[PDB]
Design a protein around this ligand. Structure first.
Ligand code: HEM
Ligand code: HEM
Ligand SMILES: Cc1cc(N)nc(CCc2cncc(N3CCN(C)CC3)c2)c1
Ligand SMILES: Cc1cc(N)nc(CCc2cncc(N3CCN(C)CC3)c2)c1
Ligand SMILES: C[C@H](O)[C@H](O)[C@H]1CNc2nc(N)[nH]c(=O)c2N1
Ligand SMILES: C[C@H](O)[C@H](O)[C@H]1CNc2nc(N)[nH]c(=O)c2N1
Ligand SMILES: [Zn+2]
Lengths: 411, 407
């Protein structure tokens, strides 16, 4: 079966065959499309074909398909599964696996970089203290004094689902949010609930607008423990504007390291429930979403005031005007401080080239248009005009429930 | 099977039950989502009729009435005898309004019940069509105070006698290929323009030549008509702050009028059914003016603003984009021609959604089309989960007639 995608700007037509290797569900049916929907303990039974599927892909990739090495490995994994109900990946397989989960991540526009991923094997970790040490090392390596390097740290896989390793933070670095008794919010409104948890767990909150949250780390299904990332490891960028001298006085700054820590990495049927990964920011994540969402720092008004735009009617587009300036400032600031960042034009242009390369060499590139198109200026970027097919390949990154909702407290 | 949609900005959750009346297909499967893809007898006919007549009679609190049963009976008889049937005026109007109501890619559906329906089913010739279309244009335009309208020509019979408006929209600008290798006018309309010339149009070869109508009646060959220039309201584009903006020589037409779609009501197909409302500014200022494959004016404007165009990261493109969209809105407002900005329009649609969930149990919506082409996430629709499904009556895409026409 063949599927075609068309770019409506260039009339370039691509043919997808890769989707034939798709696995899990989309959430859609012939009767309904759930394209804009944000969200959607394993037996040996289901486990061996998943292991075998993965190992076949791995051995194909190194051009050793059907080799004695391939066959021995299947044999080895098979026995280990029937003996122990699970199996351990070789280091090479883990690395291949982690890289491919990123390659497969249909919501990630940064995938041109997928083969350059530093994989830190933390499968020997046994305690929250050990997790903390690993994560510190990841932060320091990835930050690299502003010259950011993509990395992922992989903690031990799930066993019976009662000994899960989890990073409770949604991201390694985020700012605290505090609800005031008057209903106003200080800091990042999105993080109010998680901040309360941290506080309950013993965190002494400074209660400012940009307090870096402590790590809340769970090893082996035990109660999570709090750790503060050494401040000297947390790289931050004061936000200023190249033309507007008043922008610095807004008091804005942001952290340089975007690092997702709440997702589950599936490789060959195995589940890695703690697998924090990091790259570098695309400007709009901070400038559009973090700063300008009504549910976040929500600075559009203050900025527009300082620009003295006509704010009495939306049709003056004062919001769009301020939005652009804020995004210029974020890009300006990061560049001036020599902290790796990419603008939405560069990143989408590079994604289109990555995508075409993937079609040519791989027969497809699953992509979620809803997430790929940037949250400002969508149609002046090339991805807007690009038809995409969304499907799910493994290895993959999956959502998982938030740990505070499922954890059995030991006390 | 009962589905929830969440707004991630407001945490409001809505429960959709209306999707369980979905009929047509999405293109999606359990293995693959095609959400970003632009394009897709007597026995077949009566259940479709019944489905529609049932929803019609339900809408007027008369479900299971004798008038309901009698109508159903009459239609069944008429299909058995004639192989088709004719809609009552009331049914035609209900159907057209609901086709709009069901248009999942339309952000402007809060206006759906306020639609003027012109019944043009008595039309027999292309001259008749031209007259009806002029009248539509004049009514809809209303000296700048736009009113939504649809004109509905005779329904398909054996498919050999289709009425078609060959133009994709009632009002558009010609496109010509230059010996300079470049393109003059609207690049998207080169092919259609050549067909007009081929069919005898004397082209002015300007940058904003309003295309003639190419009208096909009763499956006959399409004929050419020029819309009376005085009925085509256009708006010169200026900026409230940049005096030089007027010098780009830009204008656009006030009436957005889609003319290439198929209206399906109760199994009947109306292949010629031009409809119109009023513009959302981004349509002109983002897509028409700034698409690289359209008028593509970003660089020209940017230079006039003297932005640093050396590096993408100065966001000069985004800056020019905003000003271009400011000028469009300002120009229409100044000339008192109805227009709506994307903030206002998307805010309206969120209200409409909540109404539809509250009173109908859902609202089919295509997020990919509903979210505006600029400033997506500072509009409320960005943060609104939407379920996309196909309800009938419906507007459907159909094959361009030049690939179909047996000349
Ligand atoms: C190196 C430069 C990278 C760039 C510029 C980039 C860009 C982005 C952006 C803008 C998003 C959307 C984020 C949001 O809206 O919340 C995203 C999502 C995502 N990225 Fe990438 N990324 C990079 C690296 C990585 C790496 C190293 C991985 C994994 C190894 C990764 C995996 C993912 C996944 C799984 C998502 C979707 C997560 C979700 O649903 O919340 N990315 N990326
Ligand atoms: C009155 C104010 C209206 C507004 C502000 C509005 C807004 C829009 C916009 C922005 C689009 C996307 C068009 C594009 O990007 O090319 C659209 C599409 C659409 N609209 Fe509405 N519209 C209005 C009236 C109407 C009316 C009166 C009808 C039908 C009677 C209608 C039915 C549709 C349909 C079927 C589409 C999809 C067209 C396509 O697929 O190309 N709209 N509308
Ligand atoms: C690997 C990676 C690269 C990149 N460019 N962005 C990301 C997302 C980073 C990120 C950091 N902090 C917070 C978030 N949140 C913002 C709020 N959003 C709702 C969820 C994601 C996301 C990850
Ligand atoms: C009823 C209606 C209301 C509205 N605001 N917009 C529309 C779209 C109208 C429209 C006018 N001219 C041209 C187009 N084209 C632009 C190019 N695009 C690829 C197809 C649609 C669309 C229709
Ligand atoms: C409801 C909708 O899916 C939601 O707002 C999505 C839209 N696209 C997105 N795209 C990115 N990159 N990140 C997001 O959080 C979202 N949110
Ligand atoms: C490939 C993609 O579907 C295409 O560029 C779409 C995206 N969203 C759109 N949305 C609207 N309203 N109109 C359009 O023409 C498009 N084009
Ligand atoms: Zn879908």
């Amino acid at each position: 079966r063949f599927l075609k995608v068309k770019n409506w700007e260039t009339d370039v037509v691509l043919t997808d065959t890769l989707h034939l290797k798709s696995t899990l569900e989309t959430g859609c049916t012939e009767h309904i499309c759930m394209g804009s929907i944000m969200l959607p303990v394993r037996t040996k039974d289901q486990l061996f074909p998943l292991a075998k599927e993965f190992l076949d892909q791995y051995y194909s990739s190194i051009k050793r398909f059907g080799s004695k090495a391939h066959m021995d490995r299947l044999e080895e994994v098979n026995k280990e599964i029937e003996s122990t109900s699970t199996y351990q990946l070789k280091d090479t397989e883990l690395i291949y696996g982690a890289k491919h989960a990123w390659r497969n991540a249909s919501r990630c526009v940064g995938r041109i970089q997928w083969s350059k991923l530093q994989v830190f094997d933390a499968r020997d970790c046994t305690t929250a203290h050990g997790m903390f040490n690993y994560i510190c090392n990841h932060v320091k390596y990835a930050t690299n004094k502003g010259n950011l390097r993509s990395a992922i740290t992989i903690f031990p896989q799930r066993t019976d689902g009662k000994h899960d390793f989890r990073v409770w933070n949604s991201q390694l670095i985020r700012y605290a949010g505090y609800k005031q008794p008057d209903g106003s919010t200080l800091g990042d409104p999105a993080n109010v609930q998680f901040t309360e948890i941290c506080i309950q767990q013993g965190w002494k909150a400074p209660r400012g607008r940009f307090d870096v949250l402590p790590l809340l780390l769970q090893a082996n299904g035990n109660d999570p423990e709090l750790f503060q990332i050494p401040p000297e490891l947390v790289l931050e960028v004061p936000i200023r504007h190249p033309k507007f001298d008043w922008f610095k006085d807004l008091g804005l700054k942001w952290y340089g390291l975007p690092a997702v820590s709440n997702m589950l990495l599936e490789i060959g049927g195995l589940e890695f429930s703690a697998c924090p990964f990091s790259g570098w920011y695309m400007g709009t994540e901070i400038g559009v979403r973090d700063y300008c969402d009504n549910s976040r720092y929500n600075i559009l008004e203050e900025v527009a005031k300082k620009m003295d735009l006509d704010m009495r009617k939306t049709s003056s587009l004062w919001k769009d005007q301020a939005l652009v300036e804020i995004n210029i400032a974020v890009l300006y600031s990061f560049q001036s401080d020599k902290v790796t960042i990419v603008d939405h034009h560069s990143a989408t242009e590079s994604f289109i080239k990555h995508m075409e390369n993937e079609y040519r060499c791989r027969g497809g590139c699953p992509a979620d248009w809803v997430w790929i198109v940037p949250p400002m200026s969508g149609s002046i970027t090339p991805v807007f005009h690009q038809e995409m097919l969304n499907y799910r390949l493994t290895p993959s990154f999956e959502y998982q429930p938030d740990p505070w909702n499922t954890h059995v407290w030991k006390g």
